[PDB]
C-alpha cells in the first residue's frame, strides 16, 4: 500500500498554517459545489433539545 503513489511529484501553490510547529494545510471546498443542487457535506444540520 505504501509502494504506490511515489515517483513523480509536482508543485502547486496552497495556503498553510503553523500550529505547534505542525504545518496544517488549508482548503476551500466551495469551488466544487457551486452551480449544483446538492448540499455541502461540510454543512450539516445539528439538533439540540
Amino acid at each position: 500500500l505504501s509502494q504506490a503513489g511515489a515517483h513523480s511529484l509536482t508543485p502547486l501553490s496552497m495556503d498553510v498554517i503553523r500550529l505547534g510547529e505542525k504545518t496544517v494545510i488549508m482548503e476551500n471546498l466551495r469551488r466544487v459545489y457551486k452551480n449544483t443542487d446538492t448540499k455541502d457535506p461540510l454543512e450539516r444540520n445539528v439538533d439540540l433539545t
Partner: protein, 98 residues
C-alpha cells in the same frame, strides 16, 4: 429555409482530486480489479511495553495483543442519457446538404 438559432455553453470549473489539498488526507491507489474484492483487512501486532516492578509489588506480566482494521464500500453512480434520434444520427454519415 431559415433556422431559429440557439446557443451552447461549455465552460466549466474543472477540478482534480490530486490538485486539491483534500488529497493530502488520502493515499490514492488505482487498483483496477477493485470490483472483484469483497473485504480487505489489516492485522496489527502489538506487544505491550513493560517496566520493572519494585519490591513488594505484583509484577507486570507480558501480554501480546493484536487488532484488525477493515474497509467500507462506497459505490457511486452517475448517468448521462443521449437522444435516440441523436444516437442513431451518430452512425451513418450522410453526404448531402452541407
Amino acid at each position: 429555409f431559415e433556422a431559429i438559432f440557439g446557443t451552447f455553453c461549455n465552460r466549466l470549473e474543472w477540478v482534480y482530486f490530486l490538485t486539491s489539498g483534500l488529497a493530502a488526507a488520502a493515499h490514492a491507489i488505482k487498483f483496477h480489479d477493485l470490483n472483484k474484492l469483497t473485504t480487505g483487512k489489516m492485522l496489527f501486532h502489538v506487544q505491550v511495553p513493560r517496566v520493572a516492578s519494585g519490591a513488594g509489588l505484583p509484577t507486570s506480566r507480558q501480554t501480546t495483543i493484536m487488532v484488525t482494521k477493515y474497509s467500507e464500500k462506497s459505490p457511486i453512480t452517475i448517468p448521462f442519457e443521449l437522444s435516440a434520434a441523436c444516437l442513431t444520427y451518430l452512425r451513418e454519415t450522410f453526404e448531402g446538404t452541407i
